[PDB]
Each structure stands twice: as C-alpha cells, then as structure tokens.
Design a protein around this ligand. Structure first.
Ligand SMILES: NS(=O)(=O)c1ccc(CCNC(=O)c2ccc3c(c2)NC(=O)c2ccccc2S3)cc1
Ligand SMILES: NS(=O)(=O)c1ccc(CCNC(=O)c2ccc3c(c2)NC(=O)c2ccccc2S3)cc1
Ligand SMILES: NS(=O)(=O)c1ccc(CCNC(=O)c2ccc3c(c2)NC(=O)c2ccccc2S3)cc1
Ligand SMILES: NS(=O)(=O)c1ccc(CCNC(=O)c2ccc3c(c2)NC(=O)c2ccccc2S3)cc1
Ligand SMILES: NS(=O)(=O)c1ccc(CCNC(=O)c2ccc3c(c2)NC(=O)c2ccccc2S3)cc1
Ligand SMILES: NS(=O)(=O)c1ccc(CCNC(=O)c2ccc3c(c2)NC(=O)c2ccccc2S3)cc1
Lengths: 142, 142, 142, 142, 142, 142
C-alpha cells in the first residue's frame, strides 16, 4: 500500500521536504536527546500519546540497522563493499531516521502543533530569495 | 535507552521468545495480509488504535530495508558480499519484522487480549517434550 | 475512472487477492451452478438484489468472450496466434470471470456477509506457515 | 440461459431494435458523458439504483475489450487480421456497448420511464413515410 | 497540483467539452457584456458571490495577455513569429478565456443552476446526429 | 473596466508596490508551496474562502502561459524571437503571477489580516533610509 510515516500526525512526507537534508541533527544526537530525557516514558509499559508509540519503532528500527552495520563489518569479503554498504546506511538510509526522530522528539517536546506551524514557517524561509529575508531562520517556541 | 517494541502493548520481547522463529509466516504474506485487508485503516489520515500507529512504522521501516536491498543489488563490487548483505536482511533483520508484523496483524484482527492469551497458551505447548505434548498447537479464536 | 468490480459489495479487489488463483472453480462449473440454481431469478424480468444485476453482466460479458473465441477460431490466419488468443481468453482473461462469478454465486448462495467473513477466514489460513495451520482450509456455512 | 440485458429495466432487446444502429452516439462520447456526469455515483462505494450497478459492468466490460484491442495490436502476426479483429470490436461488438451505455445513460438523466416513452415515440416515427413525419424525430424531455 | 477552473462551481472541464469551441462568443463580446452590465459589482470593493471573485481574475488574466499581445507586436524580430505568437493567444489561449468568461457571465446572469442544467441539456443536443436532432439547440431561461 | 486583482481582498495594486520586485519568491516555488500543501483544498469540489477561488485562476492562468511557453518553443521561426517571447513571459509577465500567488498563499497561510499588516509594516521598512533602521526587514507571524 501507500504508507506515509507522517500522514496521521499532521504532516506529509512532502511537507518535510521543506527542511533541507542538512538541517536535521545527527542520529547520535537525537538518540541521546531521547535516551537522556525520555527514558521513563519510552521504557514505560504504557503508551502515552501516538508519538511515543511511533518513536519506539523509530529507535528500534534504527536499533536493527546498527546491528546490520556491526554485522556487515565482520562478515563481508570485499572491504570496499563493507564500507560501501556501511557508508550507505549512514547517508540516505540513516537520513530517513533523522527526519522521523526529529519530527517526534520535536513534536512531544514543543507540541504537535508548533512543529506544523514551524515547517510552514520554515519552508517560507528557505524559499525566499537570500536578499529579502532575515539572517536567522524561524525557530521553535515552547 | 532500553526500548522494547512491545512493552506497552501487553507483552515483552522475552514473551515472544516462546514462539519459535519458524512459526512466523513470511514477510511477503504479512504485507499482503495488511494491504488486502487493512488498506482503509492504514492509508487513512487518522490513527485508529495504538496498533495502527505502530504498524505503519513496521511497514515503512521494512519499506526502507527493501530499498536497501534493491540498492545494494546494484552498487556493491563483490557479488558474494552483495548476496551476503541481501540475504542478511531477509535472514535475521527480516525476522524481527516478522514478529512485529505478526503481533500487530494478529492483534487488531483477533483482539489485543487474545494474542496475549495465545502466547501464554502457546509457550505452554512447546515447553512440553515431543512425546508429551498434544498434536496440534493451540489456536486463535475470534 | 478507477472502478473496482467489488467496491460496493463489501470487498476490494485486493481483498480477493487472498484467494490464490487456483482456488476458483472452473468457469464451466460456475455457469452451470448459476444456470442450475439462478435461472428463475436471472431470466426473470425484475432484479432481486444488487448481486443478480451484477451477475447478469458477468455471464453476458463472458457470453461475448466465448463469441470472440468461436469467432477467432474461424477467421485468423496463423493457427499459432489463433490458439494463443484462444488460450489467452481462458488463462488470465477468463480468470477475472472466475473471481467475479465466484463472489456472486457464493454471495447470494451463502449470504453477502458470510463470504466477507470467509474471505478473511481463508486469507488468514494461507498466510499462516504450513506447519501450524489446520489441514483443511476454512469453509462456508449457510 | 436466455438473458436479455434490458428485460428487467422495462424494455426488451427487440424494443431497442426500433433505434437504427446509426442513432447511437459513439462510445468515446458516452464514456465521456458518463465519466463527466457520474463520477461520484459510479466510483462511489454504494450502489444508487439498478442503473448504476448495470452501468459499471458496461464500462468495465468495455474496459476489457479495449485491453483486447491494445493487446491484439501488439501480439498478432498478420497485420490484416490484427486490424480485422480490431475493427470487429468497433463495428458490431462495439455497437452492443453503444445501446447499453446509451440506454443506461438516458435512464438516469431523463427518467427510467421517459426513455421507454421515447423508444415507443421514436419507433413510430421511423415506420411511417419520410414525407409524412416531422422534420425532426421525437426528443427527450427532462 | 490538479486544479480545475470549474471544479467548485458545479461543473468539470470535461462537462464543458460538450460545448463545441465554435459556440462560445468572441472575447471582445464577453468583455463588453461585463463592462456595460457588471460595472458596479466588479469594480466594487466587496465581493458579491464566488463568481465575481473568479471573474475579476478572468478579466485581468486576459488583461495581461493583451499586454503580451501589444508587447510582442513591438519587440520581436521575425514578423512571421510575431504574428504567430499574436494569433496563438487569440487562437487557443484566447479560447480558454472564452469558456471561463462565458461560464461566469452566463452564471451570474441566468443563475448558477440554470447553466448546469443547460450544459446537460446542450450536450444531449449535439450528441444526436445531424439528421436526428432538433432544429434549434436548447436555450437559457431566466 | 478598471479591475484591480486585489481591490476586494483588502489591498490595492499600489499597496503591493511597496514590495520590490526582487522580494517575491520564484514561481516554481509558490506553485510547489501550493501544490504540496493545498492539494486537497484546491482540487476539492467546493470553494472554501475567496482566496481559494482566486488562487485556482492564478494557477490555471499561469497554467496556460506555460502552454504558451512550450507552444512557442516549437512553432516560431526566429529562435531569437522564441527566446525573446519565451524570456518575456518569465520577466514582467511572470512577475504579476508572483505577486498574485504570493498574496494568496501568504493570505490563507498567515491570515488575510496579517499580510495587510505586513505590507504596511514592510513598506515602512524600505522607505526608511539605510542607516536609521533594523538589519532584517519585518516578518510574518502566524
Ligand atoms: N521564522 S519563519 O517563519 O520561518 C520566517 C523567516 C524569515 C522571514 C523573512 C521574510 N519573509 C518572506 O520573504 C516570505 C513571506 C511569505 C511567503 C513567502 C516569503 N513565500 C512562499 O513561497 C511560501 C512558502 C510556504 C508558505 C507560505 C509562503 S508565502 C520570514 C519568516
Ligand atoms: N495447548 S497447550 O496449552 O499449548 C499444551 C500442549 C501440550 C501439552 C503436553 C504436556 N505439557 C507440559 O509438558 C507442560 C505443562 C506446564 C508447564 C510446562 C510444560 N513448562 C513451562 O516451562 C511453561 C512455560 C510457559 C507457561 C507455563 C509453563 S509450565 C500441554 C499443553
Ligand atoms: N474460525 S476461522 O475464522 O475459520 C479461523 C481462524 C484462524 C485460523 C488459523 C490460526 N493459527 C495461526 O497460527 C495464526 C495466527 C495469526 C496469524 C497468522 C497465523 N498469520 C498471518 O500471516 C495472518 C494473515 C492475516 C491476518 C492475520 C495474520 S497473523 C484458522 C481458522
Ligand atoms: N412526437 S411523437 O409522439 O414521437 C410522433 C408520433 C407520430 C408521428 C407521425 C404519424 N404517425 C404514424 O404514421 C403511425 C401511427 C401508428 C403506427 C405506426 C405509425 N407504425 C408502427 O409500425 C408502430 C410501432 C410501434 C407501435 C405502434 C405502431 S402502428 C410523428 C411524431
Ligand atoms: N434540446 S436537447 O435536449 O438538447 C435535444 C436535441 C436534439 C435531439 C434529437 C435526437 N436525440 C439523441 O440522438 C440522443 C439522446 C440521448 C442521448 C444521446 C443522444 N447521447 C449522449 O451521448 C448523451 C450526452 C449527454 C447526456 C445524455 C446523453 S444520451 C434530442 C434532444
Ligand atoms: N517589521 S517592520 O514593521 O517592517 C519594521 C522594520 C524596520 C524598522 C526600523 C525603524 N523604523 C522607521 O524608521 C520608520 C517608522 C515609521 C514610519 C517610517 C519609518 N516612514 C514611512 O514613510 C511610512 C511608510 C508606510 C507606513 C508608515 C510610515 S511612517 C521598523 C519597522
């Protein structure tokens, strides 16, 4: 079928195309921001909101890809293929767990509605020419 | 942090260790069972229960691994490593999306509570020795 | 437009994908079951339910394809192509009048709701691995 | 059995023999008229009247013949036969989907009873002499 | 995206395909019909109905194309191309502002519902063959 | 007559003269901001507010000019006239669909009243000398 990760949270995968792929912080930073702030809610035995349930899967699905990384680092033959496959998991494949982990850790941190009023307020920033606009891009308010 | 995929649905990842890894139907069967039966509740723009939200991510996360499969099938150098990595995904990492897709497509089809009364009623089956247990293993009732 | 044959009877064409293409009985058998149990309701000058109206067209549309068969059997030049076209009408083209004639002659024979209940009951059967599913697939009850 | 397409709508296939085969507008025009006036009733998931259910099948059955056309245009050997078969589906075979689409499109747009009072009113204007009837054949009123 | 000019006024761009392209009066006539009759509701500083708001844009958008015409008539090099581009605007692109200006100036003069009961009552006119339909085509009543 | 595109939305075409012609983002960006955010409201069969009705025409009118572009790119004789006419459609002619598409996609995105409190709050910025004013121009708040 045609599943969007975001279709029922209030944004489409095309709406997150506003955010350039450089914008999302590194995966090692979001896992810490969620492993050093949400260790009682994520590890808790009862789901809080639809974000916590979607954010377990984002971590665990990334939890298996790293297993794929450590696995491939010790089983292939061609080291170029090893670094080629290991480097491909942290380029485009790792990116889609930067959007996902961002959109949730920024959702249940700044409100499900402040993000969606951020993407619209950030897409309007980048699309503007680099002459008739402010120096800093718009920001998240609690 | 320590995230279990199932901790808030009523079962732990140790509880699903009862089910032997041969038990779970193939991923191509689970995907077709949710695309030919739940093509209205998944694509829909509003989440129904915590299973539908957890089951989008299970499909899409598997949706990216197949992209990793088709990608790796056309970019590596060592074909032996290519197959190794390709088989790997469908070997083990293709397993943890057999438990996940099973536990949900069997949750919101037979009830969130009938599964958990199945694993306990199936773990008690295998536990017994070959020449001690019953013929057919216990089953799911609607 | 995007017309499904089944969209308003309670099932989608993806839902009938559960049934393997070997399952549907032969067209010469369904035309006999309909013509030996649905003559007084089909030939009749007043439609009974939405199945009888959909099942006329299924027979007549198949009534023209056989005319195409008998026509092509006496007008082409290349016998190889003659058979090719003749075998193509009884392979994939004839199949879609096996699903259609099945879903109706099993609808107004066992109830419009027992099929839908059987479709899911049968779909869950095949997807199960061959070890833990019962010997016989689930069945229709009047 | 002996199925008439029209037997339960209020007219027999002999009653439509009044209409000369030149009268029916082209198939590319009725498919547009039905796809430009009935796109929320046909595609809709619930049947409105016995015409909408009979008119899906008329479109889809014609939907497969065009597939036969595009298929035969790329698989036969003798081009003379390819065109012959292609022209055979747009001469006599295509005609019977001009009566059907014409009788179903004028039944839910002018009244299921105004058509049947048209065939009888139009069938008597053709039986009389050319220099006796009105310069125009009788017409449909909403 | 897929925008129809008419999708929310009660008709689709396929529904206006009934009207042959010869039917629409000339643009110089439609512009004079709205400038000598609707010179109070258009220039006015408050929109009356959704037609007046859609009909400003139709005039102004045509207001810029004429500027393109007068511009191109004094800036190109190849006179053949100059005329080609000039004629082009009044050939086809001058047509799609004949449908638009017609459908509105005939909407808010004869009612939004009498037009839509005209296109259906005019498409049924042309559909019929030359020696089968009536003398004068159906007409608009206030 | 004398039609302003904006006269009934709360601003005059002279009021938008504050915005320098460099300010408006490119047409390929606004069509995306409206084709990747308003695909269910614009394509919907019922108009929401006077902006949605004015914004269909802005897209479609631009939809025909691009047809003029692709047309002129394959029919003229003098390639200088081709590039001269094609380049003139994306200079001054394309500009007036940058103001229009801006004023609407910024109207029904930030409120019909926040724009009009922006132009007045932006015209006061540029008119100020480049010495007794802030570094960044004033901005839109949701
Ligand atoms: N903090 S912020 O909200 O991200 C923000 C940061 C910086 C600025 C500087 C000046 N603004 C603009 O030039 C501007 C305004 C409005 C618009 C615009 C550009 N074009 C669009 O195509 C667009 C795209 C998406 C949604 C709406 C729009 S319409 C404003 C806002
Ligand atoms: N249909 S059934 O319920 O699955 C079922 C199938 C087959 C048999 C045959 C003989 N039984 C046993 O040997 C047996 C009984 C009881 C137990 C057992 C083994 N050990 C466990 O570690 C265990 C694991 C989970 C839960 C409870 C237990 S305690 C009984 C029940
Ligand atoms: N009473 S009934 O409706 O006729 C009837 C219902 C159920 C059964 C078989 C039960 N056994 C299982 O091992 C089992 C359980 C659960 C599942 C499963 C197998 N795999 C799937 O891929 C699948 C496919 C579609 C929907 C859910 C699932 S998950 C037989 C009959
Ligand atoms: N506006 S209108 O009602 O459609 C209309 C009706 C009649 C006319 C012209 C004058 N009629 C006749 O010569 C006439 C009369 C009677 C008959 C006839 C022809 N032959 C038949 O074979 C026939 C066919 C069906 C049913 C009865 C009959 S018997 C013009 C218009
Ligand atoms: N004043 S009028 O209503 O416009 C009118 C003018 C002239 C005539 C003369 C003879 N009629 C027909 O041949 C005829 C009748 C019915 C139809 C038809 C053709 N085909 C269509 O595809 C079509 C298209 C749109 C809507 C319905 C239809 S079904 C009748 C009515
Ligand atoms: N975010 S903002 O509102 O665009 C904005 C951006 C930057 C600044 C910096 C300092 N201001 C001024 O020098 C100033 C103030 C007020 C005025 C002014 C200049 N002259 C005008 O002729 C004018 C034009 C239109 C409307 C009112 C006025 S009176 C203020 C506001």
């Amino acid at each position: 079928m045609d599943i969007d990760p975001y279709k029922e949270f209030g944004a489409t995968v095309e709406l997150l195309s506003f955010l350039p792929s450089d914008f999302f912080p590194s995966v090692r930073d979001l896992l810490d921001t969620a492993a050093a702030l949400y260790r009682d809610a994520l590890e808790s035995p009862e789901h809080a909101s639809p974000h916590h349930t979607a954010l377990r899967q984002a971590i665990l699905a990334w939890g298996d890809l790293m297993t794929l990384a450590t696995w491939v680092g010790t089983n292939l033959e061609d080291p170029a293929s090893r670094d080629l496959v290991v480097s491909y998991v942290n380029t485009n494949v790792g990116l889609k767990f930067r959007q996902l982990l961002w959109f949730h850790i920024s959702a249940l941190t700044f409100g499900r509605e402040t993000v969606l009023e951020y993407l619209v307020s950030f897409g309007v920033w980048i699309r503007t020419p680099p002459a008739y606009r402010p120096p800093n891009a718009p920001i998240l308010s609690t």
